[PDB]
Nucleic acid binder design. Structure first.
Ligand SMILES: [Mg+2]
Ligand SMILES: [Mg+2]
Ligand SMILES: [Mg+2]
Ligand SMILES: [Mg+2]
Ligand code: NA
Length: 140
RNA sequence: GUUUGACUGGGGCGGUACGCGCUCGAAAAGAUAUCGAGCGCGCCCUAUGGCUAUCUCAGCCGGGGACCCGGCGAAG
């Protein structure tokens, strides 16, 4: 049963929602791979009327690139609880989000016969705290 | 020397139902009138055309009315 039910980290998105950049540079070094532009939608008063327009960057890290990052990111954060997803996710911080899920996720991300992951096989906030807390730190 | 139009609950004044498109009137095929009700067109676009690749939207919810992540979401 287990082994295929035990949590794992799938991508950690580090993004800097600026309002118009030079910031990529640090993201590249804090993570280890190129950043991606962040265009914005809708015209608004914060002199942000431009639809297509660089207004920040993000970086999606997977596997080791994500651990080797969290092995310093987490330590720089304290928070826990309430600040967790209903799907077992949590964002802290410059933002650093951690998407967590179990082994059969590809079923909902592939092209052919894709399917949505059953509520039971989903990751709960609690089942999430456990996994992570059980990895160099403490909850709440 | 001539012209100075037509429609019109008489004619004039007002209006254009004088060329066009849609809903209703219209009676569950088609056709269908009034100065019938609601309202539009006389353009604009080198992309706002064409194809291919990749992709899924509104709105709401939860975590850090811009941006980022997850979820619900046949279509508003
Ligand atoms: Mg004569
Ligand atoms: Mg005369
Ligand atoms: Mg007459
Ligand atoms: Mg008919
Ligand atoms: Na005439």
């Amino acid at each position: 049963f287990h082994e295929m039910r035990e949590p794992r980290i799938e991508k950690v998105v580090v993004h800097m929602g600026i309002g118009h950049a030079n910031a990529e540079d640090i993201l590249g070094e804090i993570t280890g791979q190129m950043p991606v532009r962040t265009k914005a939608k809708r015209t608004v008063g914060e002199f942000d009327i431009r639809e297509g327009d660089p207004i920040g960057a993000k970086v999606t890290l997977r596997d080791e690139m994500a651990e080797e990052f969290l092995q310093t990111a987490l330590p720089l954060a304290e928070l826990a609880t309430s600040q967790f997803d209903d799907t077992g996710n949590f964002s802290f911080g410059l933002d650093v989000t951690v998407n967590l899920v179990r082994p059969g996720y590809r079923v909902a991300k592939r092209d052919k016969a894709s399917r949505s992951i059953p509520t039971k096989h989903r990751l709960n906030p609690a089942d999430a705290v456990a996994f992570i807390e059980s990895t160099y730190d403490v909850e709440v």
